Short mmCIF file of C-alpha atoms and ligand atoms in Angstrom, two decimals:
data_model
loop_
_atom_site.label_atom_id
_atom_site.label_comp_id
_atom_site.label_asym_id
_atom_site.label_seq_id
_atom_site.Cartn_x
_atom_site.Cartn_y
_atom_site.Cartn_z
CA UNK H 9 0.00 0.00 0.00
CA UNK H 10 0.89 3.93 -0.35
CA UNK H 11 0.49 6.07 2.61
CA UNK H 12 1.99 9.97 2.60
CA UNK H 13 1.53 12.45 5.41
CA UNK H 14 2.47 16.04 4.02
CA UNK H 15 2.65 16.83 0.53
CA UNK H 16 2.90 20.32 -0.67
CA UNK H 17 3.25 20.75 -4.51
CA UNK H 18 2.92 24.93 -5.68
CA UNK H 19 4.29 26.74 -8.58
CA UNK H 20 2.10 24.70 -11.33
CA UNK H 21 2.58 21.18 -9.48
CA UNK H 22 0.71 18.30 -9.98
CA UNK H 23 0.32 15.54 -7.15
CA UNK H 24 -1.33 11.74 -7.69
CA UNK H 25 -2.21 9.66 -5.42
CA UNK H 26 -2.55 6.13 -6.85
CA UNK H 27 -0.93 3.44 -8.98
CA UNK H 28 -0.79 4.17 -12.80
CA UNK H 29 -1.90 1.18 -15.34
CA UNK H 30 -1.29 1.96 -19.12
CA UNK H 31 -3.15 0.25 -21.91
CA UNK H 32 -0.13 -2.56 -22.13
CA UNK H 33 -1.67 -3.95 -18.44
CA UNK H 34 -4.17 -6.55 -19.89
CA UNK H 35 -2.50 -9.79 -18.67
CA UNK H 36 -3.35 -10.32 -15.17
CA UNK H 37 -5.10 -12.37 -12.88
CA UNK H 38 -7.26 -12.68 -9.58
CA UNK H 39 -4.26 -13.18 -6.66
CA UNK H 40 -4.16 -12.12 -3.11
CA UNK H 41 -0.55 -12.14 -1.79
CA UNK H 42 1.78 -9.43 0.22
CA UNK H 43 1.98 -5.94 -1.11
CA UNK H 44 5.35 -3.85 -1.01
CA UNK H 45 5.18 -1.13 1.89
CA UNK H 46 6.15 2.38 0.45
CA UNK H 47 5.51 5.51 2.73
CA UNK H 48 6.30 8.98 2.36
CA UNK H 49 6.87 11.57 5.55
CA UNK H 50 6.97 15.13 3.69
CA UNK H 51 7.70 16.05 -0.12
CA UNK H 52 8.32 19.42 -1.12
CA UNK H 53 7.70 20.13 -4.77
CA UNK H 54 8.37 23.51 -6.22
CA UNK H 55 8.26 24.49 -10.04
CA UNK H 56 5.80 22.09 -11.89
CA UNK H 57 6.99 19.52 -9.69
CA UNK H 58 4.88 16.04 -10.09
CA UNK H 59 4.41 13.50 -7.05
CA UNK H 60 3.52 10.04 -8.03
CA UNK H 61 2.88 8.03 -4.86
CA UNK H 62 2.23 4.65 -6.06
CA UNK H 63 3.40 1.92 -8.24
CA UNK H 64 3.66 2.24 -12.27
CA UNK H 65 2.57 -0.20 -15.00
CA UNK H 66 4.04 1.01 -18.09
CA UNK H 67 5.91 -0.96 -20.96
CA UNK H 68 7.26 2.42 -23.08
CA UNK H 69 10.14 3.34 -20.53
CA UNK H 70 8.60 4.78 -17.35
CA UNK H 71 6.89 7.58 -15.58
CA UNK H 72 8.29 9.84 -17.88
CA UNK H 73 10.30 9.86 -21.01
CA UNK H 74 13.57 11.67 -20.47
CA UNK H 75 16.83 9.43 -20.15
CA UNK H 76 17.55 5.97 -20.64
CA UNK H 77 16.02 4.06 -23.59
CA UNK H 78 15.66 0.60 -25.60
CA UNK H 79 18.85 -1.31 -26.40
CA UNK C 9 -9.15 2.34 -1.59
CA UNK C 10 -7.87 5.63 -0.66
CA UNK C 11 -7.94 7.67 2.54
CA UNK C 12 -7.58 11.04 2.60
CA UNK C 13 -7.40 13.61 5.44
CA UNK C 14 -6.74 17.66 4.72
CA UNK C 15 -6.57 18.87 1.32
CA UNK C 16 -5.99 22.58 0.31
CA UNK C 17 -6.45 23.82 -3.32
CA UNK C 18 -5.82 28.05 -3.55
CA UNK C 19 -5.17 30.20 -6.68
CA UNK C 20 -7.18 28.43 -9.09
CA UNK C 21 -6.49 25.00 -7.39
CA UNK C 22 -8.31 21.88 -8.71
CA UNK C 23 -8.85 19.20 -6.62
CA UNK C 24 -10.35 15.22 -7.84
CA UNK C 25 -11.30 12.81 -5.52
CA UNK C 26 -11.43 9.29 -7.54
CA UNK C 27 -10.31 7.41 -10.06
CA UNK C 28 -9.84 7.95 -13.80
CA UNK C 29 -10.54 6.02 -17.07
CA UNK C 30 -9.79 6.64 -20.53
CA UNK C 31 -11.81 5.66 -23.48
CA UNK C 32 -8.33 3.89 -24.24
CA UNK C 33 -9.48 1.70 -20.87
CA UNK C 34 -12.42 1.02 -23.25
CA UNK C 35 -12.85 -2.50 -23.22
CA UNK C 36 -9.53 -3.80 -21.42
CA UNK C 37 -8.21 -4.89 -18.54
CA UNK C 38 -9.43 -3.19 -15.30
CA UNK C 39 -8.92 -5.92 -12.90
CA UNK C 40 -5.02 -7.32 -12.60
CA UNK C 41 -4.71 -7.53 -8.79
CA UNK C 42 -5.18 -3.57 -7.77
CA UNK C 43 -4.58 -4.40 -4.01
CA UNK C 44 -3.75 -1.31 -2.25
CA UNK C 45 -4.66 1.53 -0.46
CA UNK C 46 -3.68 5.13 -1.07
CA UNK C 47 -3.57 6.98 2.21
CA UNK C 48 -2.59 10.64 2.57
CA UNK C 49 -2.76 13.29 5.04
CA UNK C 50 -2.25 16.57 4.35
CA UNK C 51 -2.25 18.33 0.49
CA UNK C 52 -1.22 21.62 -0.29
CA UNK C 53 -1.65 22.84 -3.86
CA UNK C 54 -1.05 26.70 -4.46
CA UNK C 55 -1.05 28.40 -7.70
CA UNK C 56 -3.15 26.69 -10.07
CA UNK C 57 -1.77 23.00 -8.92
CA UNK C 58 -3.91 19.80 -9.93
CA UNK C 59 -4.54 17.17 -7.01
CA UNK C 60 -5.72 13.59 -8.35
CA UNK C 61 -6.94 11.44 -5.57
CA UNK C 62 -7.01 7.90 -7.63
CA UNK C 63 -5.47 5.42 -9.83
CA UNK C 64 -5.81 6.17 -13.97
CA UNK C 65 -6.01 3.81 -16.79
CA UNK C 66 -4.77 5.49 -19.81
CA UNK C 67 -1.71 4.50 -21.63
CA UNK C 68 -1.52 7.42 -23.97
CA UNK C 69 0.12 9.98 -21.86
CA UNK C 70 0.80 9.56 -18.02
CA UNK C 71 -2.34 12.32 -17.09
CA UNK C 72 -0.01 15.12 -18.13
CA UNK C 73 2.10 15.59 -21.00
CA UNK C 74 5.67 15.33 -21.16
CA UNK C 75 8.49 14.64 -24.07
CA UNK C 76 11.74 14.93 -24.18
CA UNK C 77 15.40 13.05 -25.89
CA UNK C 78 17.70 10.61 -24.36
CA UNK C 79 20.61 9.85 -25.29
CA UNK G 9 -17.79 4.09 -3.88
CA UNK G 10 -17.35 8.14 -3.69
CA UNK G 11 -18.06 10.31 -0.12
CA UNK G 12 -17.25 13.02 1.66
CA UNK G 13 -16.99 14.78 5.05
CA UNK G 14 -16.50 18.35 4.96
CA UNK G 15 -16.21 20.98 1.83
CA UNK G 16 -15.14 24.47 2.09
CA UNK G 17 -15.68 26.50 -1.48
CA UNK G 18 -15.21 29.93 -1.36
CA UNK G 19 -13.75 33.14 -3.77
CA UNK G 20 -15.90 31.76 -6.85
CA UNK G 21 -15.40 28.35 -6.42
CA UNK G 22 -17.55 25.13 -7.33
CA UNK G 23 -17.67 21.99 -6.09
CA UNK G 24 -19.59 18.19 -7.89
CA UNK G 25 -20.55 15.07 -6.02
CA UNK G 26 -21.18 11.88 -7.79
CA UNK G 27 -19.39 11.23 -11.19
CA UNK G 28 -18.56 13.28 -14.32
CA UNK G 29 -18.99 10.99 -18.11
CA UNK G 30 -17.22 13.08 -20.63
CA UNK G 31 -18.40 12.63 -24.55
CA UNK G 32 -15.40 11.11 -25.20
CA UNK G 33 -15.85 8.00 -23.59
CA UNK G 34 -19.68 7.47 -24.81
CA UNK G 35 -22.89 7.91 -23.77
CA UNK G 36 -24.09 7.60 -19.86
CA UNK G 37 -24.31 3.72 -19.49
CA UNK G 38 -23.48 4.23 -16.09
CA UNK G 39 -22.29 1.39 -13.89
CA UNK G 40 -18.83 0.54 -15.12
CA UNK G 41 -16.44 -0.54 -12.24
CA UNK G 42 -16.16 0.87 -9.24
CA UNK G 43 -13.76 -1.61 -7.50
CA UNK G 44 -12.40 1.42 -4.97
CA UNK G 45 -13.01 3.83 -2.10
CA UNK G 46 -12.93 7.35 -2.31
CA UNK G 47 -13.20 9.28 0.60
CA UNK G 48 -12.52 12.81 1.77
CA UNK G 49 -12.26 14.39 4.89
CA UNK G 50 -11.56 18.15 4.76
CA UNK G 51 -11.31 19.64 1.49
CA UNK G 52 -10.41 23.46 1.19
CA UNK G 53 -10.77 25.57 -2.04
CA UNK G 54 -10.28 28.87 -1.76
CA UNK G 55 -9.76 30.90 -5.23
CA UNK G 56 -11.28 29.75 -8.33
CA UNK G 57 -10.85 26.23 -7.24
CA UNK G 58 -12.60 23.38 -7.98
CA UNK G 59 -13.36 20.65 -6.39
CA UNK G 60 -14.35 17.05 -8.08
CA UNK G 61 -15.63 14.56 -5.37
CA UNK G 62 -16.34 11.10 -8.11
CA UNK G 63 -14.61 9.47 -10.85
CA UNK G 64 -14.26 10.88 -14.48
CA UNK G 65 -14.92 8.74 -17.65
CA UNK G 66 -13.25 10.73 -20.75
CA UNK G 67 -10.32 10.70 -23.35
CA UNK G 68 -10.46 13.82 -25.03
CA UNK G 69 -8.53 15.37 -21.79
CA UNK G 70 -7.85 14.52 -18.19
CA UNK G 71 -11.02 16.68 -16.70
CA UNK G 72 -9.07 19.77 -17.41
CA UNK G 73 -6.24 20.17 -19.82
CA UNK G 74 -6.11 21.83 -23.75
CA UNK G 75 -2.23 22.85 -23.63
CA UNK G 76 -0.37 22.16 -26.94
CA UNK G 77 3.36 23.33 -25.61
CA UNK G 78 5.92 21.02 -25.99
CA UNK G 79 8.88 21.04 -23.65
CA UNK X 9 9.80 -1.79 3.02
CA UNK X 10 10.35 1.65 1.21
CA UNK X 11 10.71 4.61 3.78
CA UNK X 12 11.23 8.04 2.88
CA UNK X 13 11.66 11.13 5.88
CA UNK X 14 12.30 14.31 3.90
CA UNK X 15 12.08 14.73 -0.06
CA UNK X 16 12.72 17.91 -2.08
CA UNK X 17 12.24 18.27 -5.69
CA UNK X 18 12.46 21.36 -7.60
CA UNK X 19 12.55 22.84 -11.16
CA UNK X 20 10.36 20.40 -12.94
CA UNK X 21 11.22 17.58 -10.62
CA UNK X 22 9.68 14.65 -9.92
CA UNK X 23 9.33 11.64 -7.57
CA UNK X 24 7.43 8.53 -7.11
CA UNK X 25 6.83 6.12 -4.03
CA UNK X 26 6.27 2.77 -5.28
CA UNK X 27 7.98 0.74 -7.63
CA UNK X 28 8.36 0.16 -11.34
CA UNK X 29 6.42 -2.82 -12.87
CA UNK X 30 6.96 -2.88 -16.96
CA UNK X 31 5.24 -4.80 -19.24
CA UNK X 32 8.60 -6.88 -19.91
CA UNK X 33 7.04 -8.81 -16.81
CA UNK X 34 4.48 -11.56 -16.47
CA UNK X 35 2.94 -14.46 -14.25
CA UNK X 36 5.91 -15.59 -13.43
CA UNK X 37 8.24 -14.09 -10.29
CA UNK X 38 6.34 -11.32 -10.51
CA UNK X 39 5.15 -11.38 -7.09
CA UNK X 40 8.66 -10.18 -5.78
CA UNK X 41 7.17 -9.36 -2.06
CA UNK X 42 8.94 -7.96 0.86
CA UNK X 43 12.86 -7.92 0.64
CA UNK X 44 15.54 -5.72 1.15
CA UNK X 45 14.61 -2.56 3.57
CA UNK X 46 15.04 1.23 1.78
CA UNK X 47 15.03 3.74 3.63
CA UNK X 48 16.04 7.40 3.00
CA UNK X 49 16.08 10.36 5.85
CA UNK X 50 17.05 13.38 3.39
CA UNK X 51 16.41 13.64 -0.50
CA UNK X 52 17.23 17.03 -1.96
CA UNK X 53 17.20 17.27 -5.75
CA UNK X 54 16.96 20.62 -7.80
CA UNK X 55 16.95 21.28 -11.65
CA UNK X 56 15.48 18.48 -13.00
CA UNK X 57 16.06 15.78 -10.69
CA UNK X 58 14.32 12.28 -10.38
CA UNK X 59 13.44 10.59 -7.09
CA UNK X 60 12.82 6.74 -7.41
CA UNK X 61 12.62 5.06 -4.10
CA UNK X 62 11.48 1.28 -5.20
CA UNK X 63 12.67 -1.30 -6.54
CA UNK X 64 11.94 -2.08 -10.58
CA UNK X 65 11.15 -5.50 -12.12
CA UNK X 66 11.39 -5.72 -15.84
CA UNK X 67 13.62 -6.31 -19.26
CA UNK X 68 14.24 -2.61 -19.17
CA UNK X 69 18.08 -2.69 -18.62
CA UNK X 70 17.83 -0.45 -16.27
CA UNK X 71 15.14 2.56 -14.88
CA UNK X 72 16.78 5.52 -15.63
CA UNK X 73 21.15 5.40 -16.17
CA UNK X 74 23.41 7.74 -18.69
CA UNK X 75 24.98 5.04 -20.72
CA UNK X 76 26.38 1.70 -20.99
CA UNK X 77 30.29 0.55 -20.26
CA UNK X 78 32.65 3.60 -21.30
CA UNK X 79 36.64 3.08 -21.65
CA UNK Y 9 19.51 -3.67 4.73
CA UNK Y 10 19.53 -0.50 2.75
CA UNK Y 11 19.74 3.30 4.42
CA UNK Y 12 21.21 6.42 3.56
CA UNK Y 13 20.99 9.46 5.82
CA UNK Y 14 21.54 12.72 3.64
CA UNK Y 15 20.85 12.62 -0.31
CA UNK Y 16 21.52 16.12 -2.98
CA UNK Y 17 21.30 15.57 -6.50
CA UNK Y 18 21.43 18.58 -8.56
CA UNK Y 19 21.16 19.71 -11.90
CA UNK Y 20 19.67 16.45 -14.28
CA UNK Y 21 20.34 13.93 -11.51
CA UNK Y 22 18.58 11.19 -10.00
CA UNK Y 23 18.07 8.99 -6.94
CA UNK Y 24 16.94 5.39 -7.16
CA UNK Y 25 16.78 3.27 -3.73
CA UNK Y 26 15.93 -0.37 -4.49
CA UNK Y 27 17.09 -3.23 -6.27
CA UNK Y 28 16.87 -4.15 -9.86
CA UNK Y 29 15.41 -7.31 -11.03
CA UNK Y 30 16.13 -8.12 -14.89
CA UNK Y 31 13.53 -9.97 -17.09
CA UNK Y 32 14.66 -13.11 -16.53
CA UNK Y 33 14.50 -13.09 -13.09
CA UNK Y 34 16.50 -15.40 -10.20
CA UNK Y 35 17.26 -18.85 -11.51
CA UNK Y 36 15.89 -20.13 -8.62
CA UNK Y 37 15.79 -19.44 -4.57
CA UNK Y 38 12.33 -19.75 -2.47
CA UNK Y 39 14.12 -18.28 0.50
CA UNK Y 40 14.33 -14.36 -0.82
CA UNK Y 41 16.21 -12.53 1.98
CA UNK Y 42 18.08 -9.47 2.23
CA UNK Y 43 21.97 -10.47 3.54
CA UNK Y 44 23.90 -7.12 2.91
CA UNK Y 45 24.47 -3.94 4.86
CA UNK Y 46 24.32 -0.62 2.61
CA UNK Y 47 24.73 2.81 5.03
CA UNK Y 48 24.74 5.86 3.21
CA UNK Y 49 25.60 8.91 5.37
CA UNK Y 50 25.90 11.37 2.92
CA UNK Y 51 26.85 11.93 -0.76
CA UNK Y 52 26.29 14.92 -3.05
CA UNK Y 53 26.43 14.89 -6.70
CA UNK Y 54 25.68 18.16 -8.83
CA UNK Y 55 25.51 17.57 -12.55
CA UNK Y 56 24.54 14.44 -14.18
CA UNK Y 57 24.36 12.83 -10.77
CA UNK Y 58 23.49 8.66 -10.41
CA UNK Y 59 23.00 7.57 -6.75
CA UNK Y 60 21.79 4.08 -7.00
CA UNK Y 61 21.05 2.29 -3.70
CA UNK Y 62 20.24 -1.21 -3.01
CA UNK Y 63 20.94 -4.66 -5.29
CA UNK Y 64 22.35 -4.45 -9.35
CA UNK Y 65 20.67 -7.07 -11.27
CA UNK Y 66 20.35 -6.98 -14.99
CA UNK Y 67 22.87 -7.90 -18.39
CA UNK Y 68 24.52 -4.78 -19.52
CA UNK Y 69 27.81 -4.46 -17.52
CA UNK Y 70 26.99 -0.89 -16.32
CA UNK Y 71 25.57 -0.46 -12.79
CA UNK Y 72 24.43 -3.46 -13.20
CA UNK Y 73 25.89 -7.50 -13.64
CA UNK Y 74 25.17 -10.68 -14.80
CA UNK Y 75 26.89 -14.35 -15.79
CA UNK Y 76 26.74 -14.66 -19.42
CA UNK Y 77 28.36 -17.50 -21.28
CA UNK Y 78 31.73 -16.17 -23.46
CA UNK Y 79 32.69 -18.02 -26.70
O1 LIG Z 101 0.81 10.53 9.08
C1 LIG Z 101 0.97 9.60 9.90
O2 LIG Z 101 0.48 9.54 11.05
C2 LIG Z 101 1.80 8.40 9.44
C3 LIG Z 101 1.04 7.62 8.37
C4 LIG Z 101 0.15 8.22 7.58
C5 LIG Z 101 -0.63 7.39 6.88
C6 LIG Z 101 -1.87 7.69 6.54
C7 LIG Z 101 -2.22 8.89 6.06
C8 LIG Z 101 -3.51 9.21 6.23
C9 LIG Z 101 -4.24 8.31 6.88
C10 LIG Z 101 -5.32 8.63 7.58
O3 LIG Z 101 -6.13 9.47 7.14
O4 LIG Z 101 -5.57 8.04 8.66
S1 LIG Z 101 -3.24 6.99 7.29
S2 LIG Z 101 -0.17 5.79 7.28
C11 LIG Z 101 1.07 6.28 8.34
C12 LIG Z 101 2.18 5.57 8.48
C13 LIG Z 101 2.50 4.63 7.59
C14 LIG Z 101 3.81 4.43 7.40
C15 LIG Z 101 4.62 5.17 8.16
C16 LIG Z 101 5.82 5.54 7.72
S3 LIG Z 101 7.23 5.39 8.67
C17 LIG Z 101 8.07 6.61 7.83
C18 LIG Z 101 9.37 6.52 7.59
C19 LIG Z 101 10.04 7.43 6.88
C20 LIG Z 101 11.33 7.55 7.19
C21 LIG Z 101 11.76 6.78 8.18
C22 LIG Z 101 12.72 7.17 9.02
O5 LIG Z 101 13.12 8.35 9.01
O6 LIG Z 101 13.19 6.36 9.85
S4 LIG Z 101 10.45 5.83 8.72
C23 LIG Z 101 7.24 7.12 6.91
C24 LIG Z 101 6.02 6.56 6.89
C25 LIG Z 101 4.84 7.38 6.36
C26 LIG Z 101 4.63 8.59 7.28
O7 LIG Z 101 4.78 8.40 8.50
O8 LIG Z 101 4.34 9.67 6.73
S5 LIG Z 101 3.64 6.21 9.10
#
């Protein structure tokens, strides 16, 4: 699970609170096991900063496409 | 499942409490073992910042856009 | 599920309970999903800010965005 | 498992709580669990920094690097 | 375990604390336990800055290892 305590995000910031699952997640099925623990105290975010607290199902790269691509 | 405490929007602040599907989601796969809950205290969003409150299903663009080059 | 405890709107500001199905992802068939919780406590918008309390169904944009510059 | 005290991000900045799960991935070890312990007391990143505090499962060579082997 | 006290990446750097976990996987191992001791007090890195924290698993050769057969 995901749990934060304070977030502030100003200056144009954007701030999500949840896992992201692109339209490549469609293989999946019905499983209840253990979940990884990730918690956040306090994130500061200034200047169009963007807080993603969860996990991310992608297949193109990652959050965000800026470094680092296919070999 | 999400649990959320004190949020503050200001300066044209918008604030969503929920989750988001595309009409990419149309017809896919919404169920792949989403076990986890999304806890949060407090939110502070000041000058025109955008708060989302929820998972997305989209695939086309993590909920903002962004494009850059590697390497 | 969507709820809410406490909404403060103020300076020209608007808030929605229930759910918002944009155009884009068709008609109002209503009844989709629904496979989360989203709850609010305190929500604070102060400033032209808005305040969503239910999940979106779109694909044209996320609620609110029509920017076309590229970084 | 993933613990974070203090994290700044500034000038388009952005970091995510959670971990990276890519398509590259399937029914099969994907259930990676509880492991190794990672937690961070301070994270201060300005001018386009990245924050990934997770672990990433995947064919993706790597989340985010400069290059490969240099001489 | 993995900690690190104090954390400043500046100008296009990033952070990742985890471990990486290539495509392919562990050959093997139903007893998945952490047996190493990372402390980080405190490093600083301005200017294409690459703090990676916890486990290097993957096939390049470059922050990262692997076997490989050589003929
Ligand atoms: O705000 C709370 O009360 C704490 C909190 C808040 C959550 C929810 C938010 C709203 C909910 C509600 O409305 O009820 S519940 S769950 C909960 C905890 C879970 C995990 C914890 C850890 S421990 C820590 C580490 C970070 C660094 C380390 C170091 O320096 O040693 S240890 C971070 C987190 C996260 C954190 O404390 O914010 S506290």
């Amino acid at each position: 699970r995901n749990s934060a305590k304070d977030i502030r995000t100003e200056e144009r910031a954007r701030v999500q609170l949840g896992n992201v699952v692109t339209a490549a997640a469609l293989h999946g099925g019905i499983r209840i096991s253990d979940q990884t623990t990730n918690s956040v105290k306090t994130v500061v975010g200034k200047g169009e900063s963007r807080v993603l607290i969860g996990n991310e199902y992608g297949g193109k790269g990652f959050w965000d496409n800026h470094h680092h691509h296919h070999h």
